[PDB]
């Protein structure tokens, strides 16, 4: 309403500090345990490591978001821009696709037990991550070639596209990211875990109910974290691209939604590894 601004940017810089350290320490701790003690000979630990590694590299980009919000410019050239963007995108899909194949692995484990023998092997887990490496590297190479700086008096770092001939490939790219990094994931992880519980509910007394309650609570939480963290920023980006506004509160809310996306990566070590009944022991 007035000239004096509220200390919201200080609060934002403080949340970023928590999410950054919690995420960087957490995921570095998980990898350390797997490298020095578990040796990742099982398919389970292979997923846990690759998720921890992807979430460890996504938090690496986080201080750049923090800095850009407060400075309101990218003065570090196109060379760093291309690097920071590619790391931010590549490991976003590597984080979300590993997270989704864990859902598919747990789904096949219960619903296709004979297939589980031929799918939940250390080799198969490795191949699945080699595929997740390829699918992400496509966006990674795209971020290295298209990433750059634009003068449109505050310097911006983003994927640069030609504006000629009523082009809309900036919007188009965002819709592809929205469906392959949120829509098909959310739906795959919702369908897989729902069908998984439905299978266990269809088993015929206290032992079944004890596991069903523990698993349903776990399932609700893991997807709740993915929905609570990615839904705000995916919608914000998509609506800003279809429209929106560039206010102070609108800029503050955007980087708060950015922080939520990084929160998913910071909670994954606690939600999947420091809750794994095999990783604790």
């Amino acid at each position: 309403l007035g000239s004096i601004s509220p200390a919201i940017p200080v609060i934002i810089t403080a949340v970023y500090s928590v999410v950054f350290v919690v995420g960087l320490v957490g995921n570095s701790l998980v990898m350390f345990v797997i490298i020095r003690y578990t040796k990742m000979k099982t398919a389970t630990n292979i997923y846990i490591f690759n998720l921890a590694l992807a979430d460890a590299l996504v938090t690496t980009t986080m201080p750049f978001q923090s800095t850009v919000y407060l400075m309101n410019s990218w003065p570090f050239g196109d060379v760093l821009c291309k690097i920071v963007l590619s790391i931010d995108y590549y490991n976003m899909f590597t984080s979300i696709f590993t997270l989704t194949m864990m859902s598919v692995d747990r789904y096949i484990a219960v619903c296709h037990p004979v297939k589980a023998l031929d799918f939940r092997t250390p080799l198969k887990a490795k191949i699945i991550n080699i595929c997740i490496w390829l699918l992400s590297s496509s966006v990674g190479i795209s971020a290295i070639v298209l990433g750059g700086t634009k003068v449109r008096d505050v310097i911006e770092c983003s994927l640069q596209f030609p504006d000629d001939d009523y082009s809309w490939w900036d919007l188009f790219m965002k819709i592809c990211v929205f469906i392959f990094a949120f829509v098909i994931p959310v739906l795959i992880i919702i369908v897989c875990y729902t069908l998984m519980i439905l299978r266990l509910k269809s088993v015929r007394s206290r032992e079944k109910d004890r596991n069903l309650r523990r698993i349903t609570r776990l399932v609700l939480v893991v997807v709740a974290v993915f929905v609570v963290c990615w839904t705000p920023i995916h919608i914000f980006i998509l609506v800003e691209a279809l429209g929106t506004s560039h206010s102070t509160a609108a800029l503050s809310s955007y980087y708060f939604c950015i922080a939520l996306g990084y929160t998913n990566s910071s909670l994954n070590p606690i939600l999947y590894a420091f809750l794994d009944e095999n990783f604790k022991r």
């Epitope: 037990p113 596991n211 009944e277």
Partner: nanobody, 117 residues
């Protein structure tokens, strides 16, 4: 017989065997695998939770063997691939009563597995 064990016998070295243990009377849950070599003592092979989601494996066979549980048919499976002359043993099914980690209540009769020429 309570724990119905099958899928053993002779196999060529580097060959595969899918062991299966089922309790049709539903008096227990087959959730574990143990093996006893001609000389060596009782050795843990692999375990899995009631849900059939979390499979535990011994470092020795973790790389080759794969276990699964058919919650619907109350059946436990043990896929044994790239079988070496060290895997030749009597494989026992471990079942847990309906009424505590990696401890079984009902053992198996045995489904002797031989890896020879």
């Amino acid at each position: 017989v309570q724990l119905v064990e099958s899928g053993g016998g002779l196999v060529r070295p580097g060959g595969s065997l899918r062991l299966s243990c089922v309790d049709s009377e539903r008096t227990s849950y087959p959730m574990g695998w143990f093996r006893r070599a001609p000389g060596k003592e009782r050795e843990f092979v692999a375990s899995i939770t009631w849900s059939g989601i979390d499979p535990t494996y011994a470092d020795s066979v973790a790389d080759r063997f794969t276990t699964s549980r058919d919650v619907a048919n109350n059946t436990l499976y043990l896929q044994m691939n790239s079988l070496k002359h060290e895997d030749t043993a009597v494989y026992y099914c471990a079942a847990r009563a309906p009424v505590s980690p990696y401890d079984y209540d009902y053992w198996g009769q045995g489904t002797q597995v031989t890896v020879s020429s």
